[PDB]
């Protein structure tokens, strides 16, 4: 594919969809809900420690910067980020603690 | 006393269409692993590098 | 290959330790995928033969 000979730690976007980028966050509790779209990571970070369920959709992973930011803030291993950005692969399931 | 395993390693040549097979026969005995091949060069270079540079959990294991 | 890896996972000899037994599943699963892929490839080749047949018949018609 696009990556060949890279060490298994490099974050490359193998896909070819780079047209659009956005981030939508929907934080919903059995009481209320709050939805907002943006293109920044600072307003996405605080939801890690919120006990209420949250759904953070990063539409467009051509921006390796945002994926790296959210992965390193949410305690996501760089290998998992590489798997996210590596497009040409089988559906996978991995269980971390 | 040992576990004996026989595999084939396949190689494909571009500009032609021919499979070439090399038998690799490996025996696990008394915390050692013997390997038997017929050509120099194989497909286990990643394992060699991992053992060399303490990569992966192979070093911690038997 | 599938028989070898299934036998390596199914039933554990004293030489193989349980700690590494799940790892074999990985390669075993891999082997299964390989078979499927190879099986699929076979089908494709047959279809290729078939399409050629179709071609000549259609070509004949023309």
């Amino acid at each position, epitope marked *: 594919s696009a990556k060949k000979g*890279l*060490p*298994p*730690g*490099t*974050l*490359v976007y193998t896909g070819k969809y780079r047209e659009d980028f956005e981030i939508e966050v929907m934080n919903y509790s059995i009481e209320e809900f709050r939805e907002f779209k943006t293109t920044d990571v600072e307003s996405v*970070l*605080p939801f*890690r*420690d919120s006990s209420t369920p949250t759904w953070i959709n990063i539409t467009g992973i051509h921006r*390796t*910067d945002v994926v*790296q*930011r959210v992965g*390193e*803030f*949410f*305690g996501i*291993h*760089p*290998l*998992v980020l590489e798997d996210i950005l590596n497009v040409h692969q089988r559906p996978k*399931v*991995e*269980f*971390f*603690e | 006393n040992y576990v004996f395993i026989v595999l084939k390693m396949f190689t494909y040549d571009k500009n032609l269409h021919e499979l070439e097979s090399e038998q690799v026969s490996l025996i696990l005995t008394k915390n050692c692993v013997l390997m038997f091949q017929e050509k120099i060069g194989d497909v286990f270079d990643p394992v060699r590098e991992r053992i060399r540079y*303490n*990569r*992966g*959990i192979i070093r*911690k294991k038997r | 290959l599938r028989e070898v890896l299934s036998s390596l996972y199914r039933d554990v000899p004293p030489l193989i330790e349980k700690e590494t037994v*799940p*790892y074999f599943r*990985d390669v075993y699963d891999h082997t299964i995928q390989i078979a499927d892929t190879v099986e699929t490839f076979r089908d494709i080749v047959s279809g290729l033969l078939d399409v050629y047949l179709s071609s000549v018949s259609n070509k004949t018609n023309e």
Partner: antibody
Amino acid sequence: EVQLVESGGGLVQPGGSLRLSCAASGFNIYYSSIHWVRQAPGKGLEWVASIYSYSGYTSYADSVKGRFTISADTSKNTAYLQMNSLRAEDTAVYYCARSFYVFKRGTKYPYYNYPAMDYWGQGTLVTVF
Amino acid sequence: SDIQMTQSPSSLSASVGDRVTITCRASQSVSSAVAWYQQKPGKAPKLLIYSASSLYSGVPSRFSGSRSGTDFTLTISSLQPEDFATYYCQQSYYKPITFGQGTKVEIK
């Protein structure tokens, strides 16, 4: 064989600019993460910055977020930490370190170690006065 | 909202060949991402333990690392006079890599 060294530590009048240079031998920084760590005299270690040079990703600490700027050079194979408008709290010994992790892929329960700084340079004193 | 890892004891007094344990606890579960570093006076800290249990290649096998939930411990079985230096507990799970406040082991 592999070793990191830091140079450029020097006295800076509060509000100045200063560039630290971390030169590494034995590995290419284009493929690895370079971490800048800070240690005030008598206090513990305080992580400053990190660069993943391949994607040009620069992560910073809150205390220097926007103030410092970390950037790598592959041709020179050197990681530079630029500072603008240094404050009083910035006086400390700075070190550059290489993070690493050993991993095994494939399993449904993969063994993914998290990166830990491995090789640290000798560090340099950065005094603000 | 960066993780704060509290490491205790703040100071440690011990003699040669003593079993000494320095424990650091993280506010959130950092899995097994904790590392233990040793720093000699006026020197670059060297990595003792990574992944909270594994022993680095090069360090003597004397040091040990244990994990229990959100608690991590660095243990020295037979302390040596060379091992009288500051010890730091680090997380690697989350974004700002945070160290412990430090622990200095001094001869008693």
